[PDB]
Amino acid sequence: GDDRELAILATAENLLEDRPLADISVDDLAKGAGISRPTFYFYFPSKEAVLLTLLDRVVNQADMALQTLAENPADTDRENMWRTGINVFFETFGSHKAVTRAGQAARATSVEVAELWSTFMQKWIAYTAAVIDAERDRGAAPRTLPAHELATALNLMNERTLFASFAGEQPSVPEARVLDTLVHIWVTSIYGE
C-alpha cells in the first residue's frame, strides 16, 4: 500500500535523472513501480502530483534540518554559523537535483508547486531576518538595510545561484565553489557597515 506509494515516488525520482516530466508517462511510472496504470491512479491523480509530493518531501527535509540546526547551535564563529546554515540547503537540494530541477520548472505551470515554493521561501526569509535582527540586538551586526529586505535578496541569490550550479547552467559558479561564494556575500552583507 504505502510501499506502492514509495515505489512510485522512487521510480519518478529515478526517471527524472534521465529526462523531464513531459517525457515521462503515467505508464512509465506504473511500469517502474510494478503496478498497473489504474492502480497508479488510486495513489496519485497525475504525474504532476507525483512531482509535487517529491518536491514537498525535499522542501520539508531542508526545513526540518534547518529547525534541527536552530535548536542545536554549532559552537563557532559567525562565518561558520552562516556556512552551516546555508549548507543545509546546499546538501539537501544538492542530494535531490532532478527533483530540484523539475520542481523549479513546474513553478511556471503549477499553482500548487509555486505556492509550495513561496510558502517555504517566506518561512526561510523570516527565519533569516530573525537571526540578522538577533545579531544586530547583540551589537555584532550594524543596522544597515531593513533586515527582511536584506534576507529576501540573500535568499533569492541562494535559490538562483545554487540551482544554476546544480544544473550546470552557463553561467554558474562551480558546485565546488558555490558554498564559499554564498557565505562570503552573506557575511560581508550582514556584518559590513
Place this chain on the structure above:
Amino acid sequence: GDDRELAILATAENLLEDRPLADISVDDLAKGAGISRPTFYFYFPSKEAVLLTLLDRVVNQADMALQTLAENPADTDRENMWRTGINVFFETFGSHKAVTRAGQAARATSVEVAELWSTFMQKWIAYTAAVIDAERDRGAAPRTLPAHELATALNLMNERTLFASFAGEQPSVPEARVLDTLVHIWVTSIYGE
C-alpha cells in the same frame, strides 16, 4: 515593410501586458498590427520568434546603455558608481516588464531564448569581474573571492531579485527598495575584507 514589423512587435509587447504568449495567437498579432495572418508569416516564422526579437531588443538596449556608461564614467564615489551600473538593468528591464516576464518563462522551452540570456549574462559577469579586478589593482578592494565567481553570484542575485520584484512575486523586495538592496550587497561584498 519595416513598419509592419515594428507594428507586430508593438502589438505583441502590448498583448503580453494582459496575458501570456500561450494565450496570444498569430491571428491576435496579425489583427493588432493591421495585416493578414499570411502577411505576418512573411515577417516572422512564429509568435515565439516575435518574443525572441522583443527580448533581443531589450537585452541589447541594456547592453548598449552599459557600454555607454563604461565609456563615460560618472564622477562619484564607488557606491554611486555601482548604483548607476545596476540602475541600467533596473530601468531597462523595469521599462519592459511583460517582455522581461515572458522572456524569462521562454527560457524553459526555447533554446534560442536560453542561449540569448546566457550569452549576455556571460558578457555582463565578465564586465563585472573586470571592474572588480580594476578596483583590486587600485588597492580600493581587497582580494577575497575569485572575482569571476563573486561576479557570477552578484549577477544571478540581480536577475532573480529584480525579476521577482518586477513580477510582484511572493516573496520579493518591493520595487521601490530593490535598487538600494542590491547596491548594499554589491558594495559590501566587493569592498568587505
